Structures are given as C-alpha cells and as structure tokens.
C-alpha cells in the first residue's frame, strides 16, 4: 500500500475516505466529533488496507459507529512513538459502539489503553491486554457497559487469567484473540502456530521470512524488515529507512541529518550545516 501522514478527521464522513489508499499512517489518527452520522453510513464503509499506526489512535464522539471490526479489519500494530497523554489508544465517549472488534491488533509497542464513558460497549473483559501491551497497569478501562458486569460476552478461543478468573478471550462473538506460542515472542505466528521471522511483529503471511512480515519489529527497508538501517540509509520516524534524497526533499519546505537519522531539528548543542543537512557542533552558544 501507501504511507500517509497524520490524520484528524471530524464532522464530515467524506474526509474519512482519505484512508482508502493507505496502509501505514506515519503519525496519529483521530476520528472524532460526528454527531449526525448513523449506523447506515458505516455498514458499507471499510478500510482493510490500514495495518500500522506510528503514533496513537483516538475515537471520540463518533455517533452511529457500532464496531471497528469492519472499519479497521487489518490493524495490527500501534507503535506509539508519540502518545496521547501516555495512551496509544483512546476510546472516549464513543456512544453506540457495541464492541472493539480489532481482531488483528496484536501488539501496542508503546503506551497504554484508555476506554472510558463508552456506553453500549461490551466485549471488554474478554480482552487480555497483557498479550498486547507490556504496561497494562497504566491502563484505564472504566465507566463502560462492561463495568456493570452484565454484558452478553460470548465467544475454541484461548483462555487466560486477568485478576482471578479463567475467562476465554475473544474480540467479538466470532473472533477470538489470537495468542501465539511462547516461543514466537512478539514476532507473531500463523494459524497453524509456526512463528514468523525474528524481525516480524504481530503477524505474517509465511513463517521464517523477514520479507513476509505484516509489520516490522525494528525498521522497514526495500520490502523487508531489518534490524538497523545500514549506510548509506537513514532511520526515519524510527520505523523505516530512507536515503539522503528523501530527507533532502522534506527539508526544502526542514529536516536534518544526525546520528544516521533524518530528524526535524538538530538537538541542543548542534547546529545544521547548510550544505549537507548535517548537524555540527556549534561554536559557543547556538542561536
């Protein structure tokens, strides 16, 4: 697919169609403030190409939206490079929402989950976020319909322990929570249980192949997951590799080069060399 920058879609639903040719959102995604929408506008709407989000995901006051299983059916990794107040996923006041349905969300690399004041929302206790997040203590899933203990959560699905109950884990009524073998770590596995390549992250189409990863554990280059961007490439947005030509076009209306990375600004103590975009140590204080 294609890689698109951060989005902030609100009010109209026509702005939402900007994700039709998008697989990786290099930034955040905020869908919010849609008061006149109905569930009739979401039954036929789908964005199956979206796979990964670099920053966070925000859903707030999107009326009519009852589930996300049809909106983002292939969302797998939320890297959380930049968080929304230490949250990589915020589901706040999402009325009419019946379930999450992100049956492909396998790993949130950074941040926590905030799901608050979402009425009519069930299928929450049937989610083991510890298999998705490393810091589940910082989660905050309260004030939902699942808090009333009377949700119609019905799931073959794997069963784990959250507090002191052996409950089966499933996203919807027909989608379990995919749990890979312990040996696969976070690399992901196939339906049969074969671990993906050690450079994958979440899921893959063929095991033991870094070119078949759905997402990259470190960096993406030439259609293959790599551990580091080798020379003469540069680490951009801490997820993919780019050449000097790419980092140069972004500067001409203001990114720079530092520590083999294409960053927006030189750090404190370095100034940009106007010739080769390379940050150099300043002479005394820098302006």
């Amino acid at each position, epitope marked *: 697919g294609e890689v698109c920058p951060g989005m902030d879609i609100r009010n109209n639903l026509t702005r939402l169609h900007e994700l039709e040719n998008c697989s990786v959102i290099e930034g955040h995604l905020q869908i919010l403030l849609m008061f006149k929408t109905r569930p009739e506008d979401f039954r036929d709407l789908s964005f199956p190409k979206l796979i990964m989000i670099t920053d966070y995901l925000l859903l707030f006051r999107v009326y009519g939206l009852e589930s996300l299983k049809d909106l983002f059916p292939n969302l797998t990794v939320i890297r959380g490079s930049r968080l929304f107040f230490n949250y990589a996923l915020v589901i706040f006041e999402m009325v009419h929402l019946k379930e999450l349905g992100l049956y492909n969300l396998m790993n949130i690399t950074r941040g926590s989950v905030r799901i608050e004041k979402n009425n009519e929302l069930c299928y929450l206790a049937t989610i083991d976020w510890s298999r998705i997040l490393d810091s589940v203590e910082d989660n905050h899933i309260v004030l939902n319909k699942d808090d009333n203990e009377e949700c119609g959560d019905i799931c073959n699905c794997p069963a784990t322990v959250i507090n002191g109950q052996f409950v089966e884990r499933c996203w919807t009524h027909s989608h379990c929570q995919k749990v890979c073998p312990t040996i696969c770590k976070s690399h992901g596995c196939t339906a049969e249980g074969l671990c993906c390549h050690s450079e994958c992250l979440g899921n893959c189409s063929q095991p033991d192949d870094p070119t078949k990863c759905v997402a990259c554990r470190n960096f993406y*280059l*030439d*259609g*293959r997951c790599v*551990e580091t*961007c*080798p020379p003469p490439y540069y680490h951009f947005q801490d997820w993919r590799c780019v050449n000097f030509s790419f980092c140069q076009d972004l500067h001409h209306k203001q990114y720079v080069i530092h520590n083999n990375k294409c960053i927006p600004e030189c750090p404190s103590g370095y100034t940009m060399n106007s010739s080769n975009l390379l940050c150099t140590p300043c002479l005394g204080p820098c302006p």
Partner: antibody, heavy 118, light 113 residues
Framework: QVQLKESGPGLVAPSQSLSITCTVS????????VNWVRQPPGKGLEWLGM???????DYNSALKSRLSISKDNSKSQVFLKMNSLQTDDTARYYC????????????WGQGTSVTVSS | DIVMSQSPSSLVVSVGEKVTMSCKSS????????????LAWYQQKPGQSPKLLIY???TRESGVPDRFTGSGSGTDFTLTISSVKAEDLAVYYC????????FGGGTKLEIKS
C-alpha cells in the same frame, strides 16, 4: 531454498570482456542485495561490487572503471560485465546474497572459473 | 576507502589447541545508531565456498560451533578458536560491511600431523 548459481564462459581472451550471470532463487532481489566476489588461484577473496534492492550499485574503487553490474528482478538474475581483461583477472567469480539490514554475505554460489589467456 | 589487514599470514597448530587471529581496520566500524561493529568473519574450507561464521564482531551465525568466538570493537578485532578440531583446516577471512565491503588477507590455519 535459497540458491545462487553462476554461469560464465570459462575462457576469455586477454583484452576482451567477461559476462557472468547469477541466477538466484528463494528470495526476492527487490529486498536483498547481491555481491560479486572473485578469488585468484591461491590468493584471497576480492570484493568486486554489489547491487542493492532499489538498483543502486557500488563498485570497487580500483576496478570501478571496468566493472558493470545490472539485474533483472522478474527473471531473478544479476549480471556482471568486466572490460579489458588481463592475465591476473583469471579467478573464480562468486555471487553472494546480502541481507544488508541484518547479516552480511550469507549464501554463496559455487562460483564459476574464468581463465584469461590465449 | 577502508582497508583491512589480518595477521598472521599462516600458522600451524596441533589438535585441541587455542588459536587467535587478528583483523585490523583502517577506520572504526562501530555504528553509532545501534552500537555494533560492521565486521564479519568467514571460513573457507578447501574445495568449498566461504561460510559465514561470525557477524557483527561477536554474533555467531546459526549453526556455528561455540568454539569460534569473535571479539573486538572499533578497529582491532580478533577471532579465537577454543579447541581446534581437525575439520577446522581452512582459510579465515574478515570482511567489513560498514561502507562497501573489503576482505582481509586471510589467515591460513593448518593442523599438524
């Protein structure tokens, strides 16, 4: 099933050209680089050049003028052409895959022997 | 233009002995972004193609015995064989892959008999 095979002429007259084809299988050439390394009889390995996945090519600083590396991704083939051969160019020419982001040259072909004489 | 150099050229040794070979680089191979050295060691047994033993200065390739240990950082690197077996009769090359690739002269490891 990663495999790489060389196919050279074996005998080239001096001051002619050498054309070798590396037929790869088991990995996409779009994501892996392929090096060219020769080895004179009884001497050490010598890196000639490599071609990246996007198509960019790097060459030996001493032999950049004579070397030429191209590839065809649909055919899974990498080509090597050398100009103005000499008697000291007699060597076995290998081609090796290069997962440049992770590991160096891992899978090497059996190489092809090329003798430059009259 | 990076230049490698190995030492010694050749060395004879008996079975079950310790062997250490060096590999000096003209330029530091340490990558600042991941703190790893772009150096690999290669073993070429007689009648065979080169085999990747150790990459990233110290990381062993899948299927390499633990007798081969790679040490060093920056410009001075060494390869150590704990207990030399009879099957280790080969020529060992070191290759840098930071910018371009350069092979060393290689150390010929011969086994006494």
């Amino acid at each position: 099933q990663v495999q790489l095979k060389e196919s050279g002429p074996g005998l080239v007259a001096p001051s002619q050209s050498l054309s070798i084809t590396c037929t790869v299988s088991g990995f996409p050439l779009t994501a892996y680089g392929v090096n060219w390394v020769r080895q004179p009889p009884g001497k050490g390995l010598e890196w000639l050049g490599m071609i990246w996945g996007d198509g960019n090519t790097d060459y030996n600083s001493a032999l950049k003028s004579r070397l030429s590396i191209s590839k065809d991704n649909s055919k899974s083939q990498v080509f090597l052409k050398m100009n103005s051969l000499q008697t000291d160019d007699t060597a076995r020419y290998y081609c090796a895959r290069d997962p440049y982001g992770s590991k160096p040259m891992d899978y090497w072909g059996q190489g092809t022997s090329v003798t430059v004489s009259s | 233009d990076i230049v490698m150099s190995q030492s010694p050229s050749s060395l004879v040794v008996s079975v079950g002995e310790k062997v250490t070979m060096s590999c000096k680089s003209s330029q530091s191979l340490l990558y600042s972004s991941n703190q790893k050295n772009f150096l690999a060691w290669y073993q070429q047994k007689p009648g065979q193609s080169p085999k990747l033993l150790i990459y990233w200065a110290s990381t062993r390739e899948s299927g390499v015995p633990d007798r081969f240990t790679g040490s060093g950082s920056g410009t001075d690197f060494t390869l150590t064989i704990s207990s030399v077996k009879a099957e280790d009769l080969a020529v060992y090359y070191c290759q840098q892959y930071f910018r371009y690739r350069t092979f060393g002269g290689g150390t010929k490891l011969e086994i006494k008999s």
